[PDB]
Amino acid sequence: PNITNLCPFDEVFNATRFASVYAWNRKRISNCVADYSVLYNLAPFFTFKCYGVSPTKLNDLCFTNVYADSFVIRGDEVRQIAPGQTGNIADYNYKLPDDFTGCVIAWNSNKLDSKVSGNYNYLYRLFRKSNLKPFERDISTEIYQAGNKPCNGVAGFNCYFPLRSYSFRPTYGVGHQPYRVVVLSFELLHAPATVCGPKKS
Amino acid sequence: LTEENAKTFLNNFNQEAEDLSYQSSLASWNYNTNITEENAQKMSEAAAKWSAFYEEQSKTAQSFSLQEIQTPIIKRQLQALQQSGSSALSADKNKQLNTILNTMSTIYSTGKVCNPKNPQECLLLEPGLDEIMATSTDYNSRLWAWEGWRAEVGKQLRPLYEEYVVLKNEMARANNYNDYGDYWRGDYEAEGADGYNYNRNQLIEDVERTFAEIKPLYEHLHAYVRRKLMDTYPSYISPTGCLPAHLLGDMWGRFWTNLYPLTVPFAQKPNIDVTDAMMNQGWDAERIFQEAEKFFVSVGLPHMTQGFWANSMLTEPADGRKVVCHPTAWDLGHGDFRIKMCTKVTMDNFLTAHHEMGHIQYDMAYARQPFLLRNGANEGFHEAVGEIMSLSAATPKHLKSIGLLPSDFQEDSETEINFLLKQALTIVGTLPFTYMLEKWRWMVFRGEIPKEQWMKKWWEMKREIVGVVEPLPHDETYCDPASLFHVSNDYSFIRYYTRTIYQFQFQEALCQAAKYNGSLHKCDISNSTEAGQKLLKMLSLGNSEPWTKALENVVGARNMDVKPLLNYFQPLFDWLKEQNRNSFVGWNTEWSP
Ligand SMILES: *[C@@H]1O[C@H](CO)[C@@H](O)[C@H](O)[C@H]1NC(C)=O
Ligand SMILES: *[C@@H]1O[C@H](CO)[C@@H](O)[C@H](O)[C@H]1NC(C)=O
Ligand SMILES: *[C@@H]1O[C@H](CO)[C@@H](O)[C@H](O)[C@H]1NC(C)=O
């Protein structure tokens, strides 16, 4: 049959506003036809790294739900968006499990996220008491109590505000320029799998 | 626990320090490449916010006790952060010291000596009097310029230096230092591990040890220069005496490199200037920096960033904005590396491009370090790693490899001798001046020189160490050191001495790494990745390790060695021994004409 009703990847990838990595945006994707040749055929999407499934057989093997997680990090922290990695982003902002089935997509976004005055609208979590569980978010703004004295809501010595700004500027080096990352996580459940790619005649 | 608290404190400090330091460096770049009042005031507020944040964090960092910190990288970061500097005094004394420093800077930048009986011919140092020191051959005009700038700067800077010494001594003793000389020698203090321990009080004797065996080469060079200047000035210079202070090619005698037309060995042999070859092949500044980048990727160090080519200025802009002519390599932070240089298509700017890109490569390599450890191993390392690239870039092998010099070029011994003599006038001749100036400043700050016997001491040691005599007797109302830029503007001067030693140490280590089988001054480190890796082990360190460890990583030694420096100048030293047989090597301390 002739196909319609493509999955809204234009809404996730071509969004005018992404999210900070501490409050990373999650969109569920179901009951549509997901074509992934849109993402591979664009050369600005530099990093297209897939885990558990091959990038070539994305359109035929098909799934129940697809989670698209969008956020912005810097260039050298894209490697932390992978199973089994450690760092600030992996431990405190966005954790993938060790059996992650999906793809990570990242591209440079200087013309959209860098300001000469400095983009102070992208934040990340630098301090947290314990590491994040996989696919967990923390949007809490509680002052990190690193010592023995109680913070009582006021910053200072041994009391730090945990969300620190990615002050993006266009003249930064390539490892510090803003990179937009979309993580596609594919899951199969007991439900009928309703996200399936196109076929031919 | 205290160490984990210090780790989280440094993690909190690094991000705001990097952001504010980038803002300050970008504002300073925007002033330096675009001079106006709004860029100046923007630089002022950016530097004010960054300095205020740094002192605010340093007051909190002094609360940590270092006796319970085990990991030496966190301990070294907290050592770097706890340096309060000039903020250890009260606000009144700090404001008085800043007033003295600012009036010294604005009286050195506006120094003025004017022609007697010709009151319209008033000359500043920077445009016109340096031309007289560099070019003029008349004895009386040089005696005029030297004695006049000595008078109208020393008479105005003697009491300023009198309270400057006392305020700097109070600031240093507020930071648990013995004097301001020990505060400057604390830049060479190394505390990491065992066998890598370096002390401040050790440094002086090491410098003296390295002056124990540069002294014969300097004595032979001094004798040759004295004979050639006696050829220039017939009756005004004595064979057994010291050199007059105003015949040395500079204002202070700091560099002897302007004596090269007077002291050329072989005038019939031309120099190794390849400026006309750049003119004939249509080179521009972009090709100059591309050839420097080709050298740095042939040795194995990484390529230049795209932001380097995008953001730097490599040419006089000529679009109405005023710039500073001095080349400077900028590490703005966050992977931003720029070079400000008004590059003309000459050989000197080609070597300067190699030098400043060596600075940039040194800055790029320790970017993986934390923010407080993104510096040189000490103050001499950073300039030595640019001077070695300037050394390797000027060799005939490098110039023949890149087509600037023809493939059939003949390197006879005479051009090696006069090239080595020009290098000696630049390099060896500045070493007794540097050592004597820093020794004078150390003994002044210590109080070993009495306060009313300053000048009488200084002209003893320039008769003793440098072998340079005053032309006219000076009493204690003069302040003759203070006519120099680095001492009137509060700059450490031993970094040039240690630069000169570390430069030839690094060059011999890289040439043994590159397996060069000839004389050291002909050596090129191009197309040698193993020399680049031997270098980049030290460049990746920063000041994360003690500087003795980085020095052992390059040369295999834990201290300053001048055997590489004497090995560089060995053909010239043999030639100078061969032409000082009849003459008298050395000088006599009493004033001989
Ligand atoms: C985003 O915009 C480009 C612009 O041509 C378009 O080709 C592409 O299909 C859009 N969507 C995605 C998901 O890239
Ligand atoms: C120099 O600074 C002025 C100050 O606003 C600015 O308008 C001008 O564009 C600057 N020049 C360049 C070449 O950026
Ligand atoms: C270094 O490599 C380049 C690569 O083409 C070559 O042109 C050059 O001649 C080499 N240098 C030497 C000294 O052979």
DSSP state of B331: E
Rounded Cα distance, B56 and B74, in Å: 19
Element (H, E) at B566: helix B563-568
Give yes or no for residue B403 CB within 6 A of ligand 3: no
Question: Is the Cβ pair A157, B60 closer than 8 Å?
Answer: yes
Q: What tokens were used for B102?
A: 């600012």
Residue whose Cα lies nearest atom 1 of ligand 3: it is: B527
* Residue B383 among known ligand-binding residues: yes
Residues 6+ apart with CB under 8 A from A30: A64, A65, A66, A194, A195
Instruction: Compute how many other C-beta atoms are within 10 angstroms of the C-beta atom of residue B391.
Output: 26
A73 phi, psi to nearest 5 deg: -130, -175
Tokens representing residue B551 in the block = 């020095």
Q: Quickly count: other Cβ atoms within 10 Å of residue A156's Cβ.
A: 10
Ligand 2 binding residues, C-beta < 6 A: B 34, 36, 38, 319, 321
Angstrom distance (rounded) from CA B163 to CA B101: 11
Phi, psi of B57 (to 5 degrees): -75, -30
d(CA A93, CA A134): 10
Residues near A26 by beta carbon (within 8 Å), at least 6 away in sequence: A67, A68, A69
Q: What angle do CA B155, B158, B163 make, to 5 degrees?
A: 150
DSSP 8-class letter at B113: E
Q: Which residues contact B66 (CB under 8 A, 6 or more apart)?
A: B75, B78, B79
Phi, psi of B545 (to 5 degrees): -110, 165
| Among B residues 350-409, those touching chain A with beta carbons less than 8 Å apart | 367
Find the closest chain A residue to B13 by CA distance.
A160
What are the C-alpha distances in Å from B354 to residues B294, B357, B359, B401, B565? 10, 5, 9, 16, 21
Residue B333: in which H helix or E strand, if any? strand B328-333
- Residue pointed to by tokens 């022609």: B115
Distance (Å, rounded) from C-alpha B33 to C-alpha B315? 11
CA angle B521, B522, B528 (to 5 degrees): 110
Residue type, B80: A
Q: What angle do CA B361, B363, B367 make, to 5 degrees?
A: 115
Q: Which two tokens stand for residue B13?
A: 């400090």
Ligand 1: centre distance to CA A52 (Å): 26
Residue B307 vs residues A168, B15, B22, B102: alpha-carbon distances, Å: 14, 21, 15, 35
Of A157, A165, A174, the CB nearest to B335: A174
| Rounded Cα distance, B37 and A181, in Å | 42
Within 10 angstroms of residue B334's Cβ, the number of other Cβ atoms is 22
8 Å CB contact between A32 and A138:
no
B4 lies within 8 A of chain A by CB: yes
Distance, CA of B529 to CA of B556 (rounded, Å): 19
B218 touches B432 (CB < 8 A): yes
First to last CA, chain B: 71
B19 at the A interface (CB within 8 A)? yes
- Give residues with Cβ within 8 angstroms of B529, minimum separation 6: B299, B300
Determine which helix (DSSP H) or strand (DSSP E) holds B338, and give its type and residue range.
Answer: strand B336-340
Q: Residue A177: which of A117, A112, A105 has the closest Cα?
A: A112
Residues belonging to chain A: 201
Residues B394 and B507: beta-carbon distance below 8 Å: no
Tell me which H or E stretch contains B339. Answer: strand B336-340
Find, among B338, B344, B391, the residue nearest to B508 by Cα: B391
Longest dimension (CA), chain A: 71
Positions of B marked catalytic: 356, 486
| C-alpha distance from residue B10 to each of A126, A146, B15, B88 (Å) | 12, 12, 9, 22
Cα–Cα distance, B330 to B7 (Å, whole number): 28
The Cα B31–Cα B519 span in angstroms is 45
Identify whether the C-beta of residue A100 lies closer than 8 Å to the C-beta of residue A139: no
- Report whether B458 belongs to an annotated binding site: yes
Rounded CA separation B303/A58 (Å)? 37
Strands A178-187 and A163-165: unpaired
Cα B30 to ligand 2 centre (Å) = 9
Token match 């030290």: residue? B538
Tell me the sheet residues that pair with A33: A6
Token pair, residue B82, equals 């706890």
For residue B183, the tally of other CB atoms under 10 A from its CB is 22
Residue B352: in which H helix or E strand, if any? helix B347-365
Tell me, what DSSP letter sits at residue B258? G
List of residues 6+ apart from B143 with CB closer than 8 A? B246, B471, B472
Helix (H, G, I), strand (E, B) or coil at B198: strand
Is B277 strand, coil or helix?
helix
Strand segments (E) across B16-156? 112-114, 122-124
Using CA atoms, how far residue B375 sits from B62, B297, B365, B368, B472, in Å, is 21, 23, 10, 12, 44
Which of B288, B231, B238 lies closest to B262 in space, CA to CA? Answer: B231
Q: What phi and psi, each to the nearest 5 degrees, are found at residue A123? A: -125, 160
B295 CA → ligand 3 middle, Å: 9
Nearest to B210 by CA among B585, B547, B569, B566: B566
Look up residue A108 and give its two tokens.
């440079």
Residue A132, by phi and psi: left (phi above 0), alpha (psi -120 to 50) or beta?
A: beta
Residue type, B1: L
Beta bridge partners of A69: A26, A183
| 3-state DSSP of chain A | CCCCCECCHHHHHCCCCCCECCCCEEEEECCCECCCHHHHCCCCCCEEEEECCCCCCCCCCCECEEEEEEEEEEHHHHHHCCCCCCCHHHHHCCCCCCCCCEEEEEEECHHHHCCCCCECCCEEECCCCCCCCCCCCCCCCCCEECCCCCCCCCCECCEECCEEECCECCCCCCCCCEEEEEEEEEECCCCCCCECCCCCC
- Selecting from B8, B9, B334 the residue whose C-beta is nearest the C-beta of A173 gives B334
The CA distance from A16 to A50, in Å, is 25
Helix (H) or strand (E) holding B244: strand B243-244
Interface check for B15 against chain A (CB to CB < 8 A): the answer is yes
Q: Are strands B243-244 and B468-469 parallel, antiparallel or unpaired?
A: parallel
Please name the residue whose Cα sits nearest to atom 9 of ligand 1: A38
Nearest to B226 by CA among B212, B243, B214: B243
b/e B538-549 (16+ beta carbons within 10 angstroms → b):
bbbbbbbbbbbb
Q: Which chain B residue is nearest to residue A146, measuring alpha carbons?
A: B5
CA distances for A129 relative to A123, A138, B109, B317, angstroms: 18, 12, 55, 53
**Which tokens sit at B253?**
């005698």
Q: Are B147 and B471 in contact (CB under 8 A)?
A: yes
Please indicate the experimental technique that yielded this structure: cryo-EM
Report which residue type is found at B274: V
Tell how strand A25-29 and strand A65-74 pair up: antiparallel
Backbone angles phi, psi at A106, to 5 degrees: -140, 145
Tell me how far apart the alpha carbons of residues A186 and B8 are, in angstroms, rounded to a whole number. 37
> By the 8 A CB rule, do B296 and B361 touch?
yes
End-to-end CA distance of chain A: 8
Nearest CA to ligand 2 atom 7: B34
How far is residue B514's CA from residue B300's CA, in Å, rounded to a whole number? Answer: 12
According to DSSP, the residues that pair with B244 across neighbouring strands are: B469
Q: Is B526 in the pocket of ligand 3 (CB under 6 A)?
A: yes
Centre a 10 Å sphere on the Cβ of residue A57 and count the other Cβ atoms it contains: 11
Phi-psi region of B253 (alpha: psi -120 to 50; beta: other; left: phi over 0): left
Q: CA of B7: how far to CAs of A123, B71, B233, B495, in Å?
A: 21, 10, 66, 32
- Secondary structure E strands in B435-481: 468-469
Q: Which candidate, B501, B385, B379, places its Cα nearest to that of B435?
A: B501
Location of structure tokens 């205290």:
B2
- Cβ neighbours of residue A116 closer than 8 Å, sequence gap 6 or more: A169, A170
> Which chain A residues have a beta carbon less than 8 Å from that of B334?
169, 172-173, 176
What value, to the nearest 5°, has the Cα angle with vertex B511 and ends B528 and B564? 160
Amino acid sitting at position B93? K
Tokens matching residue A113: 């996220």
Q: Which two tokens stand for residue A99?
A: 């059996």
- Containing B390, the helix (H) or strand (E) segment is helix B381-393
CATH architecture under which domain A9-124+165-187 falls? 2-Layer Sandwich (3.30)
CB A22 within 8 A of CB A157: no
* Spatial CB neighbours of B558, under 8 Å, sequence gap ≥ 6: B195, B196, B548, B549, B551, B552
- How distant, in Å, are the alpha carbons of B172, B224, B403, B417 from that of B220? 40, 6, 37, 14
Entry resolution (Å) = 2.8
Across the A/B interface, how many CB contacts are shorter than 8 Å? 53
SS3 B324: coil
Query: Is B527 near ligand 3, meaning CB less than 6 Å away?
Result: yes
Contact (CB, 8 A) for A49 and A84: no
